[PDB]
Amino acid sequence: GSMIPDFMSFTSHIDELYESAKKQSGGKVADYIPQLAKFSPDLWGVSVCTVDGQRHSTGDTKVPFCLQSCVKPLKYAIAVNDLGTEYVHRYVGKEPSGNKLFLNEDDKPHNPMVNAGAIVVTSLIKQGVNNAEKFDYVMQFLNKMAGNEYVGFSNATFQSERESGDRNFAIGYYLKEKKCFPEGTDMVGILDFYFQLCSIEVTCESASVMAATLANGGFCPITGERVLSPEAVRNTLSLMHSCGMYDFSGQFAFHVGLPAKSGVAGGILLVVPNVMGMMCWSPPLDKMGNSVKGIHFCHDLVSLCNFHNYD
Ligand SMILES: O=C(Cc1cccc(OC(F)(F)F)c1)Nc1ccc(CCCCc2nnc(NC(=O)Cc3ccccn3)s2)nn1
């Protein structure tokens, strides 16, 4: 599957799109915790990792930042990989909401990409062991996805996220009341694990390798290791396609047509199946919560290389 005939000319076009996006100065850096409000609005990085293992970065691609919602497709993939589609979707829905409600009509969170869904997915991983082992288990998994490149942890983000996460505690108690967790779940402990996962740190470079693992049918392109089952990958990409960009998800599926997942740190994890993974990062967000520069870049990328799913 050679739709990138000349990698060096392709990176030349990446750089031009990078420079064009750089001029987009709009948006607001998230500031509900100090660990996000700190970030400069001018940070802007794009990293590419093909399914071959070819790499290209431009801009601020080695500055660590928190995954935040970008971790949601990754922990869903781990859950499906270990437990199968059917078991996971006993607890969480499979489609966009069209949203302030915690649960759909079946008393399940709408999908794994919204907070209530990610909290339920978190309760499914490595059940029975304590939180330190749960975290270590997911960390080892993310190391394999990233081919052992930068995966860190921001204790300061974790502490601030947990102390100000009233909406997530409201979701936690509502899900407990509607019996959404597996039997024996310690809800407060699940919220802790959830806040920790949101505080895992990557760079553009390490994250693009994670995305490239999803683009490569579950095989890490820079180690050849099998990390995720084909089922886990397929499921994760479908939900990223339809639910990955908050309230912009429907527009993004229509105009861009690639599986992607945004996050409040300004990251956009982007997958071009069978071609490449990308991570774009610029902290200033539009009013729907997506990185202004990243969105502009994603539109330009598809209008240039015919990467749209139905192109
Ligand atoms: O009940 C379900 C299935 C369901 C599916 C579809 C329709 C439906 O009927 C309903 F919309 F009327 F509820 C119910 N899910 C569910 C129900 C309750 C909850 C916990 C509560 C969610 C958090 C909120 N609390 N108050 C709110 N008020 C507003 O947002 C203000 C507003 C503005 C505009 C129009 C209406 N209100 S949000 N979480 N999830």
Numbering used by the authors: 218 to 315, 319 to 531
From the paper:
Others and we have reported that BPTES inhibits KGA by binding to an allosteric site between a pair of homodimers, and this results in a dramatic conformational change in key loop residues (Glu312-Pro329) that render the tetramer inactive. Additionally, we determined the crystal structures of the cKGA (catalytic domain Ile221-Leu533 of KGA) in complex with the trans-CBTBP enantiomer (1S, 3S-CBTBP), and CB-839.
CB-839, unlike BPTES and trans-CBTBP, is asymmetric across its center and has multiple unique moieties, including the replacement of the terminal phenylacetyl groups with a pyridylacetyl group and a trifluoromethoxylphenyl acetyl group, as well as the substitution of a pyridazine ring for one of the two thiadiazole rings. The complex structure for cKGA:CB-839 was determined at 2.1 Å. Similar to BPTES and 1S, 3S-CBTBP, several hydrogen-bonding interactions mediate the binding of CB-839 with cKGA. Furthermore, the thiadiazol group of CB-839 is also involved in a water-mediated interaction with Asp327 of cKGA. The terminal moieties of the inhibitor–fluorine and oxygen atoms of the trifluromethoxy phenyl group, as well as the nitrogen atoms from the pyridine ring of the inhibitor are not engaged in any hydrogen bonding contact with cKGA. Hydrophobic interactions between the aliphatic linker of CB-839 and the side-chains of Phe322 and Tyr394 from cKGA also contribute to the binding. In comparison, the driving force for CB-839 binding is the higher number of hydrogen bonds and this is assisted by the hydrophobic interactions from the pyridinyl ring.
